[PDB]
Design a protein around this motif. Structure first.
Motif, PDB file in Angstrom:
ATOM      1  N   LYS A 195       2.686  11.190 -11.778  1.00 12.61           N
ATOM      2  CA  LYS A 195       2.215  12.556 -11.974  1.00 12.61           C
ATOM      3  C   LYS A 195       3.312  13.478 -12.487  1.00 12.61           C
TER       4      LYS A 195
ATOM      5  N   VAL B  55       2.215   1.895  -3.609  1.00  9.99           N
ATOM      6  CA  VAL B  55       1.224   2.370  -4.572  1.00  9.99           C
ATOM      7  C   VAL B  55       1.152   3.892  -4.556  1.00  9.99           C
TER       8      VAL B  55
ATOM      9  N   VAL C  96       0.832  -1.200   0.000  1.00  8.91           N
ATOM     10  CA  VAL C  96       0.000   0.000   0.000  1.00  8.91           C
ATOM     11  C   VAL C  96       0.868   1.253   0.000  1.00  8.91           C
TER      12      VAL C  96
ATOM     13  N   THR D  23       2.311   6.466  -7.783  1.00  7.41           N
ATOM     14  CA  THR D  23       1.381   7.452  -8.323  1.00  7.41           C
ATOM     15  C   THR D  23       1.992   8.848  -8.305  1.00  7.41           C
ATOM     16  N   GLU D  24       2.759   9.168  -7.259  1.00 10.59           N
ATOM     17  CA  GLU D  24       3.436  10.459  -7.206  1.00 10.59           C
ATOM     18  C   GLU D  24       4.447  10.597  -8.338  1.00 10.59           C
TER      19      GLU D  24
ATOM     20  N   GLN E 193      -5.659   7.446 -16.535  1.00 12.63           N
ATOM     21  CA  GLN E 193      -4.576   7.534 -15.562  1.00 12.63           C
ATOM     22  C   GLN E 193      -4.723   6.468 -14.484  1.00 12.63           C
ATOM     23  N   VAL E 194      -5.954   6.230 -14.032  1.00 14.02           N
ATOM     24  CA  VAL E 194      -6.191   5.199 -13.028  1.00 14.02           C
ATOM     25  C   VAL E 194      -6.021   3.814 -13.637  1.00 14.02           C
TER      26      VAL E 194
ATOM     27  N   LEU F 254      -2.208   2.964 -13.942  1.00 11.40           N
ATOM     28  CA  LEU F 254      -1.645   2.644 -12.638  1.00 11.40           C
ATOM     29  C   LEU F 254      -2.291   1.420 -12.003  1.00 11.40           C
ATOM     30  N   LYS F 255      -3.482   1.025 -12.458  1.00  7.65           N
ATOM     31  CA  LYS F 255      -4.140  -0.146 -11.886  1.00  7.65           C
ATOM     32  C   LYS F 255      -3.440  -1.432 -12.307  1.00  7.65           C
TER      33      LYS F 255
END
Lengths: 9, 225
Positions: B71, B63, B60, B67-68, B84-85, B88-89
Motif C-alpha cells: 500500500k 501476508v 498468515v 500488504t501493508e 491489487q488482490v 498480492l495473491k
C-alpha cells in the motif's frame, strides 16, 4: 488466502 | 551516469520504499544478520538442533505485513482493487521466501522473530515428506545470500515482485507495468551505487525471480500431500 488480502486494502 | 533530477527522484523513491520496508516488517535483514553473527543484540536465540532441544523449546502474519508495504508503493493503491488482490495473491509467496533468506545462514533459519533458531539438518531429518519442506528454501538462500543484498536493496526488489504484470487474471496490465518500469529503474540505480564489486548484479537479481517461481511451484506440489 485472498480473504486476508481483501481486508487490509 | 550523472546526478540529475531523474536520478534524484529514483533515489527518493528508494528512500521512501526503504522507510516503508522498516515500518512494515519488524525483523529486517540487518537485525537478522546481527543476531546470526557475533554483534548480537538482546537475549540469544534458543537453538533447536535435535529432538531433545525441540522439547525444551516445545505465514498468515507475513501476508498482512506485505500488504501493508504494498500500500506504500506509489501508484499501487490507485490500481483496480481486483488487480491489487491479484498481484498480492501470486506474489506473497515469492516475497516470503525472499524475506526468509534474510533469516537464514548455512546452519539454520531464525524463527519466532529471532527468539529461536532451528538448524537446517534437523529440518531435513524429519519424516518424509516433511524433511523436504524447508530444504529447497535453504538451497535458494545460500545462492541468494551470496549476492549480499541489504535492506535498501531488498525494499525495491520486493516492490518489483509485487508489480508483476504477468499475473493470471489482471484486468489492467499496462498501468501495472508502468509502475514496475519505475521500480526497475530505481532498483538498477540502487544496485550500481551500493554494489561496486558485483558485475551485472541487476541481471542476476532478475534471474532470481525465475528461481522464486520454481520454489512456489515446488512448494504447492509439496502441499498437495
Amino acid at each position: 488466502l485472498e480473504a486476508i488480502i481483501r481486508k487490509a486494502l | 551516469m550523472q546526478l540529475n533530477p531523474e536520478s534524484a527522484d529514483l533515489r527518493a523513491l528508494a528512500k521512501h520504499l526503504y522507510d516503508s520496508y522498516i515500518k512494515s516488517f519488524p525483523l529486517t535483514k540487518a537485525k537478522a544478520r546481527a543476531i546470526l553473527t557475533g554483534k548480537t543484540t538482546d537475549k540469544s536465540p534458543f537453538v533447536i538442533y535435535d529432538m531433545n532441544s525441540l522439547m525444551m523449546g516445545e505465514s498468515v502474519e507475513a501476508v498482512q505485513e506485505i500488504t501493508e508495504y504494498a500500500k506504500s508503493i506509489p501508484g499501487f493503491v490507485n490500481l483496480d482493487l481486483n488487480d491489487q488482490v491479484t498481484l498480492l495473491k501470486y506474489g506473497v509467496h515469492e516475497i516470503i521466501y525472499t524475506m526468509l533468506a534474510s533469516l537464514m545462514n548455512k546452519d539454520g533459519v531464525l524463527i519466532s522473530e529471532g527468539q529461536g533458531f532451528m538448524t537446517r539438518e534437523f529440518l531435513k531429518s524429519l519424516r518424509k515428506p516433511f524433511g523436504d519442506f524447508m530444504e529447497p528454501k535453504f538451497e535458494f538462500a545460500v545462492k541468494f545470500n551470496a549476492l549480499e543484498l541489504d535492506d535498501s536493496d531488498l525494499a525495491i526488489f520486493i516492490a518489483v515482485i509485487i508489480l508483476s504484470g504477468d499475473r493470471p487474471g489482471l484486468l489492467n496490465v499496462k498501468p501495472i507495468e508502468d509502475i514496475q518500469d519505475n521500480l526497475l529503474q530505481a532498483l538498477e540505480l540502487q544496485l550500481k551505487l551500493n554494489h561496486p564489486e558485483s558485475s551485472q548484479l541487476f541481471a542476476k537479481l532478475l534471474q532470481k525471480m525465475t528461481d522464486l517461481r520454481q520454489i512456489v511451484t515446488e512448494h504447492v506440489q509439496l502441499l498437495q500431500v
